[PDB]
Design a protein around this ligand. Structure first.
Ligand SMILES: CCCCCCCCCCCC(=O)O[C@H](CCCCCCCCCCC)CC(=O)O
Ligand SMILES: *[C@@H]1O[C@H](CO)[C@@H](O[C@@H]2O[C@H](CO)[C@@H](O)[C@H](O)[C@H]2NC(C)=O)[C@H](O)[C@H]1NC(C)=O
Ligand SMILES: *[C@@H]1O[C@H](CO)[C@@H](O[C@@H]2O[C@H](CO)[C@@H](O)[C@H](O)[C@H]2NC(C)=O)[C@H](O)[C@H]1NC(C)=O
Ligand SMILES: CCCCCCCCCCC[C@@H](O)CC(=O)O
Ligand SMILES: CCCCCCCCCCC[C@@H](O)CC(=O)O
Ligand SMILES: *[C@@H]1O[C@H](CO)[C@@H](O)[C@H](O)[C@H]1NC(C)=O
Ligand SMILES: *[C@@H]1O[C@H](CO)[C@@H](O)[C@H](O)[C@H]1NC(C)=O
Ligand SMILES: [Ca+2]
Ligand SMILES: [Ca+2]
Ligand SMILES: [Ca+2]
Lengths: 420, 111
């Protein structure tokens, strides 16, 4: 009787918001092409900003509509005609460069789940602490605009590394805005089918895409008292992934690439954090991550009982299963073939990330979200993107394409290409 | 009514309230007013914060002014519930010998 959502005008707004969140598509999306002019609520913080929200045929990643003579049809900021010779700018600057988008099929880490310690640390709390809170809530507490795969804002942390998207734009400026973070906090191989349709890519009308499949925890993470039986089996993961890959084959244009990320060895969490104080326990040094883990497990609300546990036996079983699921992904990429994309596998390899972080004078505990003591933070995600880029450069240079020779001219004629 | 999430939430909120009053060496009432004053008007966050004070503020004041930690507060106010035979869920060091006596006293305070 109280709820606004039964009011005359707000009823349709309510349902539209809920439907958008159910489907993980932008709430503000007039032409319904899944790209938005609004940042949050699955908006352009998650995907490229829609340069024309009144034209479903205009969105990031689309092949140019007659070389974008009269309209920038792919929101990359490149359009018009050069009066010097009458040649369309997109033709001379982008044709033959083989543009491509970046797509992340991921979980809380890929979307960069982050509860700010400023929100719960009384010693430093102020009015400025919560200015970012409305944005984070309407982003489901994710920060994809700063993530390691699809981040495009200037980083909070002091390290220079960029997201995969911005490294892809830098290589070929025609890829401006062609990013999509298709991730959910609880996403796994089991439930990716429930929002795989939120992916935007037309097999025939859009450019190819690099797709990162990064279900890197939820298949072995659970809050149940006995979390072992709840973990995905290698047989079921294979079955789940194959359905996903089969779905991608009928949506991705030819020339696409799918990269399967292995699962981490989460034992480094307990090892590096169980003695350290949680933000809530820093004022009076009376709460550690060990105390937090035990609290959450008693309540059965831990994001990952298997790894966030004092029970070494359980931590060992979780990594063992994660190793088996990673090997299953390795065997899918090595042996499964699809007409419209090539497959690749990459170990999570967080030990290599720690070593790199240690080279720069850092310690492992500084790579984990302070509040939840589980997810990798912005530092770790950018270091994972750096490791990703260099490995693909070394092993599969074709995935990233070639450096576009016309990048300087694109910058000179179009500048920031419209921003994000 | 009460599940594992309301228990976490209560312990978090009461913990921040208690630690704000300590940091600013203030009363609990002033700490709760400080917290809400920090929260934006957007998304009804500030208003919702003041409504929580309206409903639970007076009980929180009485318990926190008697030097009971967030665990005792949230169990007393029924945000956390120890079911028969099930283990005791707590976030801060807990002396088991006196827990029930402490909880008994806490109930008398808000009675
Ligand atoms: C080091 C291993 C890296 C694993 C990264 C991927 C993690 C995926 C599994 C976890 C899924 C997820 O993060 O859980 C989300 C919500 C996270 C909530 C954490 C809150 C902690 C308790 C309350 C905080 C107050 C202390 C699942 C979801 O909500 O959908
Ligand atoms: C976005 O696209 C629309 C057309 O789809 C442009 O708006 C006008 O749309 C109607 C036809 O649908 C007509 O008034 C014109 O054909 C369009 N305008 C022009 C100038 O052609 C709109 O201009 C586009 N937005 C941008 C920024 O180019
Ligand atoms: C530590 O973790 C282990 C592994 O989960 C628990 O051992 C039991 O293992 C058997 C089979 O190996 C399972 O069927 C039981 O369900 C497990 N116990 C529980 C409670 O789930 C062991 O109990 C854990 N230790 C503690 C103190 O909980
Ligand atoms: C101290 C007052 C402000 C505190 C704000 C804390 C934000 C709440 C975090 C809840 C996170 C989980 O719920 C994630 C989820 O599953 O959605
Ligand atoms: C006394 C301070 C009040 C503390 C507020 C407690 C917040 C309640 C969290 C409930 C979370 C559910 O809505 C969603 C879920 O199931 O995760
Ligand atoms: C793409 O697929 C077509 C068939 O769909 C095939 O003939 C062609 O050789 C492939 N080439 C590339 C670059 O994907
Ligand atoms: C804290 O504030 C009280 C006033 O309520 C004052 O008497 C006391 O000296 C203060 N203590 C410190 C350490 O600031
Ligand atoms: Ca749109
Ligand atoms: Ca559009
Ligand atoms: Ca264009």
């Amino acid at each position: 009787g109280s709820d606004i959502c039964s009011l005359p005008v707000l009823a349709k707004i309510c349902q539209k918001i809920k439907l958008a969140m159910e489907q993980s598509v932008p709430f503000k999306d007039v032409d319904s092409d899944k790209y938005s002019v609004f940042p949050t609520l699955r908006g352009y913080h998650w995907r490229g900003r829609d340069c024309n929200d009144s034209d479903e045929s205009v969105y990031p990643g689309r092949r140019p509509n007659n070389w974008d003579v009269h309209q920038d049809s792919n929101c990359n900021g490149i359009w018009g005609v050069d009066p010097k010779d009458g040649v369309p700018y997109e033709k001379k600057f982008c044709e033959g460069s083989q543009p491509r988008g970046i797509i992340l099929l991921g979980d809380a880490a890929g979307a960069h789940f982050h509860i700010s310690p400023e929100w719960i640390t009384a010693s430093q709390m102020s009015l400025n602490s919560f200015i970012n809170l409305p944005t984070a809530l309407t982003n489901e507490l994710d920060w994809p605009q700063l993530s390691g795969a699809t981040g495009f804002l200037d980083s909070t942390v002091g390290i220079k590394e960029k997201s995969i998207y911005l490294r892809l734009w830098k290589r070929n400026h025609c890829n401006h805005r062609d990013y999509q973070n298709i991730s959910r906090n609880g996403a796994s191989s089991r439930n990716l089918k429930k929002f795989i349709e939120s992916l935007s890519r037309n097999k025939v009308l859009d450019y190819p895409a690099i797709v990162i499949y990064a279900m890197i925890g939820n298949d072995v993470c659970s809050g149940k008292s006995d979390p072992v039986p709840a973990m995905t089996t290698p047989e079921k993961l294979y079955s789940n992934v194959m359905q996903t890959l089969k779905h991608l084959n009928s949506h991705l244009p030819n020339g696409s690439h799918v990269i399967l990320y292995g699962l981490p060895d989460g034992t480094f969490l307990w090892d590096n954090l169980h003695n350290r104080y949680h933000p809530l326990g820093q004022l009076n040094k009376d709460m550690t991550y060990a105390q937090l883990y035990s609290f959450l497990n008693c309540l059965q609300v831990s994001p990952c009982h298997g790894w966030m546990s004092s029970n070494k036996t359980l931590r060992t079983l979780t990594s063992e299963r994660a190793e088996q699921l990673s090997n299953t992904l390795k065997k899918i990429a090595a042996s499964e073939k699809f007409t419209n994309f090539n497959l690749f596998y990459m170990d999570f390899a967080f030990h290599e990330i720690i070593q790199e972080w240690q080279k720069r004078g850092g310690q492992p505990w500084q790579l984990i979200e302070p509040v939840d003591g589980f997810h990798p933070n912005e530092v770790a995600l950018l270091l994972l993107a750096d490791h990703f880029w260099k490995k693909v450069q070394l092993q599969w240079p074709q995935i990233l394409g070639k450096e576009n020779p016309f990048n300087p001219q694109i910058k000179q004629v179009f500048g920031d290409q419209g921003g994000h | 009514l009460s599940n594992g999430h309301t228990c976490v939430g209560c312990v978090l909120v009461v913990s921040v309230i208690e630690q704000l009053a300590q940091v600013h060496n203030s009363t609990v009432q002033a700490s709760m007013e400080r917290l809400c004053s920090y929260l934006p008007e957007k998304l009804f966050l500030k208003t919702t914060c003041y409504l929580v004070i309206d409903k639970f503020g007076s009980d929180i004041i009485k318990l926190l002014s008697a030097d009971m930690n967030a665990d005792v507060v949230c169990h007393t106010l029924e945000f956390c519930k120890q079911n028969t035979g099930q283990p005791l869920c707590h976030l801060y060091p807990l002396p088991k010998e006196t827990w029930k006596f402490t909880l008994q006293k806490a109930r008398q305070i808000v009675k």
